């Protein structure tokens, strides 16, 4: 309540000390931060005429100023000052150039000149940030007859295609094979050689990339752990298809359509960066592990305990890789996966068991063997 | 499916048969030590 | 020369502003921070009665606390407050843990967070943190049987250990059990003479940490002054009965693994803070407020008038029981305990009033009589109580004595062998019983000692 206020005022309004009236509702949100052994944060906001403290951080803001508050210890000891166990650091509410300054400012010649010669991986960090801080600060920088016929022909096309999420997963199934022919073909030698390749690559990674967001919120509305799984499965096939088949039709068309279609400089080579591919595996696994699960139940009677257990404890697991989910923490996925092998197997053994006397039961007949 | 299980020791135990990780715990009262009261009737209230 | 000054001293000096005496040799670069366009960093450093300004960056020192000034633009706008074009950050003095921690908390959550769901290239940025944050951890982390026995026997654990958020109260009382045994087993010296001693200690004072901030976690969620006291008891006695258990078994069987199953000169030595022990403690008073008032609802007949004024000034007490009771700041809390035992006595005495007549209702049965007194325990720990009921209470330990006089009449009239083993050790428990309860229920009375 002396640092906390102290540097708020510091930094948002008057460098100076702030009067000893802690009578706002924000005080909880401090007395949170300091007491709760878990609370390792706390941004503060300057409000209109008012400070307002909380543990959450959110990012609705335009361009605005916070600052957040970084604890070391713990709890905090109120008997030593509070700017002895605490940190600040200050940063802009935008999405590029607040991670371009914090970057290039601070971390990048932070870790340039602040390295100790016995640690690893220094090398690599610091091409990681260079790489990073450029990627932004190019963002953060940024005959009519013709181009008024590409202009109405492609964006008739691409409003068009923007309805997308109205459509079900057993349509856009088909409206993947569609899109694809439709908009090479446009980009052939009508009424120029070829178009800037701006737009070239530009619509169809938009076109790919939302494919990927409709798949992931369509599959999301199928509540892939609820009992109604018929429906899901033929849901889920579709989502599926609809992954694969864009990045089949991607690799193998682009190769001619730049070759026959538009002199395009790119010639047998790719562009799309098939993250339909990896939402599509994840959508297999689930698939395959659903499906074993229900021929599991077929022998609910020699896998019982099995099956009933192993239910709940495999819901935590497949929270590791949630609807619309994104690659970006994939390890922890294959943390689960691998818990997930392990612990099933008591299930296979006994179900193995019983599959050799089924079928070595059969008296060699090719029919009942193959069946 | 749950069931309990008394012993000489003076504990009566949990468990059931499908899900075997329910609720593993003991039962015993405020006491300690041993006390082996050798345990011989158990019954169930028939009751909600 | 405002802002450089005045943040130095608000973090780590005074909280004031200094006055405008810039006559200081540090002050040069300071200057070069603001006008130079290539300087875009400072870094200052609290020296023993010294402040150093400097653009380098050291680590030399061992955990000291440094701030660095970073710029916006190439230049300060002097006409422009010089508040609002420059930022800071701290950070402790190891090249390798402030940039993780820093990278993990602001970045990692700020672009996933703040993100367009139509918008690309982000991927890439998701990629770079996600790897810029990984080295950062790996380097802050960083025959064989050994090591894979001693993992094998941490992960059967650890997995609830890094996950405890999805556990219960009752999972924990059982989590204290079984992980006993299980870091028990990895003191065993028999699959590898090696064991390290120092990984072990180190590992205990982790969980114990960890774990103690876990329980008050849960606990401190349960908002334990609520209407419903069955519930409220029920819950906060388990929080309790895991503090209890916890601290009572690490410290015992700790002692006594370091010399049974590695014979190190250690043995019968603390190594755990204790904080459940003092969340225990904290619990037991929120249940003594909580139930004291209760007893007093249930004979209300007697003080009905009191217990009326009494809720309404409760009120505000129990508006000072906060949560994660921190011991530095618990004052607060002892004072609005004081007050309220000096406002509700005047109704202890009319509730002792009740209760003198509640005993003497009961037959003349040392069982039934004996079960009230020890069932109202904090009725009878109450100074006006105990005296205004010593007389039965001692007439109950009068009863007692009669009871081990019997059971000694019995003693001396006593292969079969096994029969009188049993015998007198069903002598020695009612016996040992009866002093126990005695000696709670009749408050050390000298009647007792004899």
């Avoid at chain 1, 395009?264 to 993250?275: A, D, V």
């Avoid at chain 1, 691998?338 to 006397?357: C, T």
């Avoid at chain 3, 349960?222 to 209407?227: A, I, T, V």
């Avoid at chain 3, 006595?345 to 007549?357: S, T």
Wanted: glycine share 4%; proline share 5%.
């Amino acid at each position: 309540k002396l640092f906390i206020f102290t540097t708020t005022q510091n930094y948002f309004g008057l460098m100076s000390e702030l009067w000893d009236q802690p009578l706002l509702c924000n005080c909880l949100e401090i007395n949170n931060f300091l007491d709760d052994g878990n609370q390792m944060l706390l941004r503060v906001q300057r409000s209109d005429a008012g400070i307002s403290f909380s543990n959450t951080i959110e990012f609705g803001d335009t361009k605005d100023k916070v600052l957040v508050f970084f604890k070391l210890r713990p709890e905090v000891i109120t008997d030593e000052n509070l700017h002895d166990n605490i940190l600040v650091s200050s940063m802009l509410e935008s999405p590029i150039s607040s991670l371009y300054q914090a970057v290039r400012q601070v971390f990048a010649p932070m870790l340039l000149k602040d390295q100790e010669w016995s640690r690893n991986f220094d090398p690599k960090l610091q091409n990681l940030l260079s790489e990073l801080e450029a990627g932004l600060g190019i963002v953060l920088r940024r005959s009519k007859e013709r181009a008024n016929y590409f202009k109405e022909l492609f964006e008739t096309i691409a409003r068009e295609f923007y309805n997308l999420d109205s459509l079900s997963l057993l349509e856009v199934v088909d409206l993947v094979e569609t899109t694809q022919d439709v908009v090479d073909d446009v980009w052939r030698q009508t009424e120029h050689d070829h178009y800037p390749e701006s737009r070239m690559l530009h619509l169809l990674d938009i076109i790919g990339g939302s494919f990927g967001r409709f798949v992931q919120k369509k599959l999301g509305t199928l509540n892939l752990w609820e009992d109604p799984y018929y429906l899901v499965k033929e849901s889920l096939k579709a989502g599926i298809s609809i992954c694969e088949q864009w990045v089949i039709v991607c690799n193998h068309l682009t190769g001619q359509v730049w070759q026959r279609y538009v002199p395009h400089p790119w010639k047998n080579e790719k562009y799309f960066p098939e993250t339909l591919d990896k939402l599509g595996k994840r959508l297999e696994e689930v698939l395959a592990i659903r499906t074993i699960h229900e021929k599991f139940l077929y022998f609910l009677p020699a896998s019982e305990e099995k099956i009933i257990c192993l239910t709940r404890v495999f819901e935590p697991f497949t929270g590791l890789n949630p609807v619309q989910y994104n690659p970006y923490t994939e390890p922890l996925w294959k943390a689960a996966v691998s818990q997930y092998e392990k612990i099933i197997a008591p299930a296979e053994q006994k179900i193995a068991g019983k599959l050799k006397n089924y079928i070595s039961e059969i008296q060699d007949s090719p029919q009942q063997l193959l069946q | 499916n749950h069931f309990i299980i008394g012993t000489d020791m003076g504990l009566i135990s949990h468990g059931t048969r499908q899900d075997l990780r329910v609720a593993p715990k003991l039962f015993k009262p405020q006491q300690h030590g041993i006390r082996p009261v050798k345990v011989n009737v158990i019954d169930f209230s028939p009751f909600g | 020369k405002l802002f450089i000054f005045t943040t130095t001293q608000n973090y780590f000096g005074l909280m004031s502003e200094l006055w405008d005496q810039p006559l200081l040799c540090n002050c040069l670069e300071i200057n070069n921070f603001l006008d130079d366009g290539n300087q875009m960093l400072l870094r200052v450093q609290r020296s023993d009665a010294g402040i150093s300004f400097s653009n380098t960056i050291e680590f030399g020192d061992t955990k000291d606390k440094v701030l660095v000034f970073f710029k916006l633009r190439p230049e300060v706008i002097t006409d422009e407050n010089l508040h609002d074009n420059i930022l800071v950050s701290s950070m402790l003095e190891s090249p390798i843990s402030s940039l993780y921690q820093a990278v993990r908390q602001v970045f990692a959550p700020m672009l996933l967070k703040d993100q367009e769901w139509s918008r690309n290239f982000d991927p890439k940025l998701q990629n770079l943190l996600s790897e810029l944050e990984a080295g950062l951890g790996i380097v802050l982390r960083r025959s064989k049987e050994r090591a894979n026995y001693f993992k094998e026997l941490f992960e059967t654990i650890a997995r609830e250990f890094y996950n405890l958020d999805s556990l219960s109260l009752l999972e924990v009382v059982d989590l204290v059990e079984t992980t006993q045994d299980v870091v028990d087993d990895v003191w065993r010296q028999t699959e590898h003479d090696h064991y390290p001693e120092s990984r072990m200690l180190h590992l205990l004072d982790i969980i114990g940490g960890s774990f103690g901030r876990f329980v008050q976690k849960k606990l401190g969620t349960l908002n334990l002054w609520e209407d419903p006291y069955y519930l409220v008891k029920e819950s906060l006695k388990a929080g309790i009965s895991i503090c209890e258990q916890w601290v009572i078994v690490c410290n015992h069987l700790t002692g006594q693994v370091w010399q049974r199953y590695v014979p190190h000169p250690w043995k019968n030595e603390k190594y755990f803070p204790e904080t459940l022990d003092k969340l225990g403690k904290r619990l037991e008073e929120v249940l003594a407020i909580r139930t004291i008032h209760e007893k007093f609802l249930y004979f209300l007949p007697a003080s009905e008038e009191k217990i009326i004024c009494l809720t309404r000034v409760f009120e505000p007490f129990t508006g000072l029981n906060p949560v994660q009771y921190n011991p530095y700041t618990e004052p607060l809390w002892k004072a609005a305990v004081s007050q309220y035992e000096k406002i509700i006595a005047p109704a202890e005495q009319k509730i002792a009033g009740k209760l003198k007549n509640y005993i003497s209702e009961i037959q003349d049965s040392p069982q039934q009589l004996l079960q009230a007194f020890l069932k109202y325990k904090e009725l009878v720990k109450r100074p006006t109580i105990s005296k205004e009921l010593m007389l039965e209470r001692e007439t109950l330990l009068a009863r007692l004595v009669d009871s081990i006089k019997d059971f000694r009449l019995d003693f001396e009239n006593r292969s079969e062998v096994v029969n009188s083993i049993v015998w007198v050790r069903q002598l020695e428990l009612k016996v040992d019983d009866t002093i126990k309860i005695a000696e709670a229920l009749l408050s050390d009375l000298p009647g007792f000692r004899c």
